[PDB]
Symmetry: C2
Subunit: 207 residues, 2 copies
């Protein structure tokens, strides 16, 4: 109980799971709540198996006052988007500036937006990966914290490449949050992000 | 001495040097037939001459494309390789050498198209950068990708430091790809993407700092 995290989900919560496994030892970080905009989100069950309180909110229109209410009430320092499917409103992004992050299944700034893996596959790139980044006003364009690269093999499908990238997301997200919790992440004057400790912000994952 | 290559340059010829060293071996499948600069001061011109490769300088603005194509035809070129060539290629030239031109770009395309791709990477604050070998088609920096090599970006890098690490990876990437082409291992798929028909791989991870 030092860095308190809130995780926003809409789906299976595989990244949430990685995050909950990583920080339930010895650990500096606490996931204080998980919030979903989908009552059918399987990630809610993962959350409940780790003893983490869960909350379902209305989707359309998104009940953002309830989200903020839950986050304030659980003393959240850092909001992690992990498969959350909505466009967040301006005030909320403004309000949590420097305190919301996301993981996106491409090597940004390439392949912003939905369907990032399919886009890469059709593109014929030979290397792909994931990016952890602060959530700013423009979708998928805030400053980059960590990146991890994976290869695309001759025999891949769009779906098999996704699994390889998702595998890499599982390693990158928790490492990233850990660096934030132990005070080693720093936004610089030029708007780029840098680590003040020994650790590196790049990962090369081979498969 | 069977795949004949023409190399187009504008600067110091670093990638040219890596290619000429790679293919000078007595048992090489690839021959560099000519070297062409759009610049009378490109130091790569002296590298070419040290290898006994004929060199040619063409007018720059407008790019004298017919002089270029005449040189290439008279040296029996099969593959046109741009290696730091700084001139937009007019659509007629790209038609005239249909599917026979490749280029090494110093980024992980499709990110950072255009000039000074390394500086773009540096200001973007990516943690991973690299280079892409690709066919030159009509659309700038968007022809089918042949090979890509990944390179880390360090905390203490400048634009030029990072440029140097990318260049180092280009020295490994450019020769590799040309040789796969020379082996007849490179095939375009039905969807337009490239594949290798052997044990070789089209991605490279250059882990070194």
């Amino acid at each position: 109980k030092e860095l308190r995290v809130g995780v926003l989900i809409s789906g299976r919560g595989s990244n949430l799971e990685a995050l909950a496994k990583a920080f339930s030892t010895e650990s500096s970080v606490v996931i204080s709540c998980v919030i979903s905009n989908n009552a059918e989100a399987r990630g809610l069950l993962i959350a409940q198996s780790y003893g983490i309180p869960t909350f379902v909110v209305k989707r359309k229109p998104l009940d953002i006052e309830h989200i903020s209410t839950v986050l304030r009430e659980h003393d959240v320092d850092l909001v992690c988007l992990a498969g959350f499917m909505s466009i967040l409103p301006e005030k909320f992004v403004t309000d949590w500036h420097h305190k919301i992050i996301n993981i996106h299944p491409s090597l940004l700034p390439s392949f912003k937006g939905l369907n990032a893996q399919e886009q890469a596959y059709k593109a014929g790139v030979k290397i792909a990966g994931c990016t952890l980044h602060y959530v700013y006003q423009e979708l998928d364009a805030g400053p980059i914290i960590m990146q991890a690269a994976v290869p695309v093999l001759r025999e891949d499908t769009a779906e098999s490449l996704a699994s390889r990238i998702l595998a890499a997301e599982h390693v990158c997200y928790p490492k990233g949050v850990k660096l934030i919790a132990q005070d080693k992440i720093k936004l610089c004057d030029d708007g780029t992000v840098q680590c003040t400790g020994e650790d590196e912000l790049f990962l090369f994952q081979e498969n």
